[PDB]
Amino acid sequence: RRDWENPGVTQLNRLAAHPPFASWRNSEEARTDRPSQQLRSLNGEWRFAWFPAPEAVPESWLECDLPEADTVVVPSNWQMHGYDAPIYTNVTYPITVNPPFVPTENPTGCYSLTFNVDESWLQEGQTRIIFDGVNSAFHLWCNGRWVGYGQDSRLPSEFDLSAFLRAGENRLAVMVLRWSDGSYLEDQDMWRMSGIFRDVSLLHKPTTQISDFHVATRFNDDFSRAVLEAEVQMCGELRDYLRVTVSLWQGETQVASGTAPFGGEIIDERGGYADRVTLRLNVENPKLWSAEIPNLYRAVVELHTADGTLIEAEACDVGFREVRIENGLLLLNGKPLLIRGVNRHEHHPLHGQVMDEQTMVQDILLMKQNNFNAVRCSHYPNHPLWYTLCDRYGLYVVDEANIETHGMVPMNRLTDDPRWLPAMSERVTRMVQRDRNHPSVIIWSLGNESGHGANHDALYRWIKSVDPSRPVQYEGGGADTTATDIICPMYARVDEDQPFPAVPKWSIKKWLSLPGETRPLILCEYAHAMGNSLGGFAKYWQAFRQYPRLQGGFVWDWVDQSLIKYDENGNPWSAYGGDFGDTPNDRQFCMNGLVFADRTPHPALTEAKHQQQFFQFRLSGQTIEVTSEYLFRHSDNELLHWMVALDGKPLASGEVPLDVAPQGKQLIELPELPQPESAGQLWLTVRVVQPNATAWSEAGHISAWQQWRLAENLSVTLPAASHAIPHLTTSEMDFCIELGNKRWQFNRQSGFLSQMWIGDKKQLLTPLRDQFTRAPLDNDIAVSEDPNAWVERWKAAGHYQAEAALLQCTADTLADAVLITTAHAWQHQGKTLFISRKTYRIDGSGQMAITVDVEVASDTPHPARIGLNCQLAQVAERVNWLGLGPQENYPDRLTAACFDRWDLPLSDMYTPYVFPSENGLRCGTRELNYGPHQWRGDFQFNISRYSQQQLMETSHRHLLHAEEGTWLNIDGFHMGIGGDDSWSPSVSAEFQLSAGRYHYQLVWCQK
């Protein structure tokens, strides 16, 4: 039958989809969500054998264990066990495009398990098997008899095994196909793996049973009263003595309860549903659910007889909340949301696509701790537990159908094709039937990157019809089609339009007001966090806050999809596309997250946390104005800490309790700030601290911060002039300067300071020279699978090959110092790119002041940076500076950083991006200390054991090796990093170094 090559066959003998069941036979257990003896897990050790095609599978396997098989854990992705390679492809399908056919060589995973079933389960009732996730299609046999077939790798497939089992031992055999026609709908940008990768379980239900239940909550105008409506359906024999009781609890208190016999209201000329009933419960002053306060009730659904015998119980967590779009705004409990979201794929560096509770909880806590309030299930229904954690911890969720046909040409080839309507329809309907009772799901999504086809319109209407409680969104076909209630573009810019034909990406501000447009706009993906990125994040936040209808978005994306591999010596390392022999592949494009695969944060995570803060602040005089962005809670676990410092020197500080109602304001008046002991800039830093632990944070957590400059007292006092004067020695080869124990040597042919000595010690490994390039970032490279790419432009202009030419090198003696003047030109193929003019003035105090004036040809691409570099001979333990920090920060990604005195071990000054590049910069620095050296001015810098050259020649962080010494890059100016997208120029004009002429000054001295 080749069911795996026919989109008209998506399953055989599969049971209806429905919300999570456990068939409790004790109501109390159901109330508290205790494990159910009737829901058994079949997870653990299974037998597995790999074959190259289904035709290669021996018939014997059906009845008996293959002695060649291995014992492996389930759930798992077979790739993770080494059976075949995982493939990383972004857009292009991993198999030839020839729907609905798949390759003849099709990796087949043959799983089996010998397990016990007690007579008790078979004497009465129904025993079904549930496979929560099988990638991509499979056939199932039990005790050698075929049972059924299934597709859609991201929803549960259930089969009735009642007629196939026997008491005692039984054997299941599952043949899993890697590719199937379902793969045409699973083209998400992620590793392509396969196997039985979600839980497998057995569930016993009685013959007369609860087969479905839907829960709804409706409110009066001010949410002071609600009606919970529970529709219950049964299967099995209708009898008048049957009853359904629905009880609602808030903690240990029962709020309401109602009971009724089956038999629904009249529906049409033929009557009503005699196998259903709707119970309605009034609830006064319900505690409402939100991501701010995830108040939950428990609904327990009992199927029982009138005499009072329980047949079975089902249940769920209920969050009383209304989601509606009104007047152009998305409202939650009548208030307009501000989505601080992130896209999150199911990825584990060791386990592949298998999810576990610990990782899920770790992700949600880091999300919450970083001011995220929402998550998009990019791009398929998640493991069931995700929803329960979101309901209980409090996150808004976008639940998305497992439909992505990005590699088709044009993109909607399948989605506009009625023959694909059935297959797509099951992806949407079964998701809704499974997840509709979760309060955390606030919006349904039709899938991702599958163009816009009629199938979409049909399905959009189906959902609107069956579940009016949530908006439906879909971005394909231009982000604003008839299949979406929300304008939900991906990578639309704040101010700049990207007018692509047919599917333009307008500036978000402009998009809201195009003629006739009235919907809210929430980006389904924005701020592509690949590598050293998130430049311009603040620009989005400023617009979201200014424009009512700009309600936020979902950053792309949470975690890097890197996988662990082992080197020849068994050490682990982070791998990406192509590292498994996979080809074609999309290399590093699989790593776009705010956190590394092990959950360590990248530096961008702090920028996101700060911009996503829930408290806004303004300063006037001595008055700090705090405004709350919360919609529902008061600041009942928050205090404000304030600190004032003079050039990093702590002056004073205080604490004030915060008592701000949602959307309210609080005025706090700072105490008299009595004169600073010396000159400099006073800085005010405020931090919102949570004194009490919560379910998602520890006592002391800081949730928000802000700084301002206060009074500045410029230094007008002079320097107690030199006890001495430096001496200059001139030679054809060099200009040497000596002062006490110091010596500086300027090479006359090169025109650079080539060596420095303190005592007998040489301070330099490589001379101090101008630098106008950087080890390109992922965004500079711009590839997702462009000669407009910054890297391309730079290379083409000769920026990385340019050679300095000496125009002038002279020495002069002043009354108290020695002054060296140089001028160099950087040229390429006759073209003068840059001209650097400098003066170095060494004085009686031993300080070397360097003044640099650079000219940039207006017609060369603006340079990545304008500074100097050198390789210091020494390797020191700490890096101390007065500037922004403590983490890495760049011009267009420095808002989260704070101006203060920071001191870190050298290593923290390096950000180990998997794909190495320029990294570790710190901006707005006025003082930098390392070893015996001190540099002063107003610059940006990075310091590490890796040169820019090495970083640009290395593909993987594990292959980096520390060089002799310490490479110092000190810049007067540095270009922003961009990141609106990672596959086109994305650095805003204001962060490009296009001024033509640049000036900067550094003071280098000892410590």
Task: Say whether residue 550 binds Na ion (CB under 5 A).
Answer: yes
Tell me which H or E stretch contains 604.
helix 604-611
The region of 1-9, 22-30, 634-642, 701-709 touching Na ion under the rule CB under 5 A is 634-642
| 947 and 871 Cβ atoms separated by less than 8 Å | yes
- Per rule CB under 5 A, is residue 406 in the interface with Mg ion? yes
Number of residues that bind Na ion (CB under 5 A): 9
Q: Which of 132, 158, 186, 189 binds Mg ion (CB under 5 A)?
A: 189
Least distance between its own copies and beta carbon 610 (Å): 21
Annotation-wise, does 630 bind a ligand?
no
Out of 686, 710, 728, 777, point to the residue binding its own copies (CB under 8 A). Answer: 710
For Na ion, which residue of 233, 247, 592, 755 counts as binding (CB under 5 A)? Answer: 592
Determine whether the annotation assigns residue 404 to a binding site.
yes
| Count of residues touching its own copies (by CB under 8 A) | 30
Under the binding rule (CB under 8 A), the answer on residue 819 touching its own copies is yes
DSSP state of 51: E
Tokens of 65: 């264990």
User: From Mg ion, its own copies, Na ion, none, which one binds at residue 681 (CB under 5 to 8 Å depending on kind)?
Assistant: its own copies
Active site residue 449: yes
Asked whether 167 and 118 are in contact (CB, 8 A), the reply is yes
43 is known to lie in a ligand binding site? no
By CB under 8 A, is residue 997 in contact with its own copies?
yes
Residues 113 and 141: their CA atoms lie apart, in Å, by 11
Q: Indicate the residue among 354 and 854 with the shorter CB distance to its own copies.
A: 854
Residues 601-620 touching its own copies, rule: CB under 8 A, are none
Active-site residue (options: 400, 525, 607, 918): 525
540 annotated to a ligand binding site: no
Q: Which of Na ion, Mg ion, its own copies, none lies near 9, with the C-beta cut-off 5 to 8 A by kind?
A: Mg ion
1002 binds its own copies (CB under 8 A): no
Q: What residues contact 651, with CB distance under 8 A and at least 6 apart? A: 644, 645, 673, 676, 682
**Of the ranges 189-197, 552-560, 604-612, 837-845, which one interacts with Mg ion (CB under 5 A)?**
189-197
Kindly give, in sequence order, each residue whose CB lies less than 8 Å from that of residue 604, ignoring residues fewer than 6 positions away.
529, 533, 534, 537, 594, 893
* Residue 999 binds: one of its own copies, Mg ion, Na ion, none (C-beta under 5 to 8 A by kind): its own copies
Q: Decide if residue 812 touches its own copies (CB under 8 A).
A: yes
| Residue 810 binding result from its own copies, Mg ion, Na ion, none, given CB thresholds of 5 to 8 Å by partner type | its own copies
Q: Which of the residues 636 through 665 are near Na ion (CB under 5 A)?
A: 638, 658
- Least distance CB 716 / its own copies (angstroms): 4
Tell me which of its own copies, Na ion, Mg ion, none is bound by residue 859, counting a contact when its beta carbon lies within the kind-specific cut-off of 5 to 8 angstroms: its own copies
Q: 550 contacts which partner out of Na ion, its own copies, Mg ion, none, CB within 5 to 8 A by kind?
A: Na ion
Is 525 labelled a binding residue? yes
Amino acid type, 327? N
Which span (406-414, 462-470, 549-557, 932-940) binds Na ion, by CB under 5 A? 549-557
User: How do 922-930 and 70-74 pair as beta strands?
Assistant: unpaired
- Judged by CB under 8 A, the stretch of 120-128, 214-222, 773-781, 857-865 that binds its own copies is 857-865
Q: Which is nearer to its own copies, 26 or 827 (CB)?
A: 827
Torsion of CA 72, 78, 81, 86, to 10 degrees: -170
Among 120, 741, 808, 907, binds its own copies (CB under 8 A): 808
Task: Determine if residue 647 is left, alpha or beta; phi over 0 gives left, psi from -120 to 50 gives alpha, anything else beta.
Answer: left
Residue from 132, 199, 302, 449 touching Mg ion (CB under 5 A): that is 449
Q: What backbone phi and psi angles, to 5 degrees, belong to 119? A: -50, -40
Question: Binding residue for its own copies (CB under 8 A) from 938, 949, 953, 959?
Answer: 938
592 binds, among Mg ion, its own copies, Na ion, none (CB under 5 to 8 A by kind): Na ion
- Looking at this protein, which amino acid is placed at residue 611? Q
For Na ion, the binding residue among 83, 141, 420, 589 (CB under 5 A) is 589
Min. distance of Cβ 833 from its own copies in angstroms? 8
CB of 855 to its own copies, least distance (A): 6
Residues 255 and 867: their CA atoms lie apart, in Å, by 69
Q: How many CB atoms lie within 10 A of CB 667?
A: 10
Beta bridge partners of 865: 974
Stretch that binds its own copies, among 247-255, 304-312, 490-498, 810-818 (CB under 8 A): 810-818
DSSP 802: -
Judge whether 855 and 967 are in contact, CB under 8 Å. Answer: no
The CA distance from 865 to 991, in Å, is 11
192 binds Mg ion (CB under 5 A): no
Indicate the pairing of strand 310-318 with strand 396-400. unpaired
**Three-state DSSP string of 612-672:** CCCEEEEEECCEEEEEECCCCCCCCCCEEEEEEEECCEEEEEEEEECCCCCCCEEEEECCC
Binding mask 717-736 for its own copies (x = CB under 8 A): -x------------------
DSSP string, 883-946: EEESS--BTTB-SS-EEEEEEEEGGGGS---SS--S---EEEEEEEEETTEEEEEEEEEEEESS
Q: Is residue 810 involved in binding its own copies (CB under 8 A)? A: yes
The span of 1-9, 228-236, 453-461, 937-945 binding Mg ion (CB under 5 A) equals: 1-9
| Closest residue to Na ion, based on beta-carbon distance | 916
Nearest distance, CB of residue 154 and its own copies, angstroms: 49
Distance CA 338, CA 548 (A): 9
Residue 223, annotated as binding a ligand: no
| Distance (Å, whole) CA 293 – CA 319 | 10
Q: How many CA atoms lie within 13 A of 285 on its CB side?
A: 0
Measured distance CA(332)–CA(276) in Å, rounded: 30
Is 343 one of the annotated binding-site residues? no
Instruction: Dig out the tokens for 707 from the structure.
Output: 């700084």
- C-alpha distances (whole Å) from 612 to each of 175, 340, 406, 554, 555 are 47, 6, 31, 12, 11
Q: Decide if 525 is catalytic.
A: yes
Out of 322, 496, 738, 855, name the contact with its own copies by CB under 8 A.
Answer: 855
Q: Is residue 189 a known part of a binding site?
A: yes
805 sits near its own copies (criterion: CB under 8 A): yes
Catalytic residue among 5, 426, 449, 607: 449
Amino acid at 6: N
CB of 652 to its own copies, least distance (A): 18
If one asks whether residue 681 binds its own copies (CB under 8 A), the answer comes out as: yes
- The Cα 574–Cα 596 span in angstroms is 10
Residue 589, annotated as binding a ligand: yes
Residue 539 Rama label (left phi>0; alpha psi -120 to 50; beta): alpha
Tokens of 728: 């200059």
**Contact status: 168 vs Mg ion (CB under 5 A):** yes
Question: Rounded distance, CA 123 to CA 120, Å?
Answer: 5
Helix, coil or strand: residue 391: helix
Which residues, including other chains, have CB under 8 Å from residue 283's CB and lie 6 or more apart?
225, 226, 227, 228, 248, 255, 256, 320
Q: Is 989 in the site for its own copies (CB under 8 A)?
A: no
Contact between 9 and Mg ion by CB under 5 A: the answer reads: yes
**Residue in the structure block whose two tokens are 């170095």:** 840
Q: Which active-site residues does the annotation give?
A: 449, 525
Chain contacts with its own copies (rule: CB under 8 A): 681, 709-714, 716, 718, 805, 807-808, 810, 812, 814-815, 819, 825, 831-832, 835, 853, 855, 857-859, 938, 997, 999, 1001
Q: Extract the annotated binding site for substrate.
A: 90, 189, 449, 525-528, 592, 983
Q: Extract the annotated binding site.
A: 90, 189, 404, 406, 449, 525-528, 585, 589, 592, 983
Chain contacts with Mg ion (rule: CB under 5 A): 3, 6, 9, 168, 181, 189, 406, 449
Chain contacts with Na ion (rule: CB under 5 A): 189, 544, 550, 589, 592, 635, 638, 658, 916
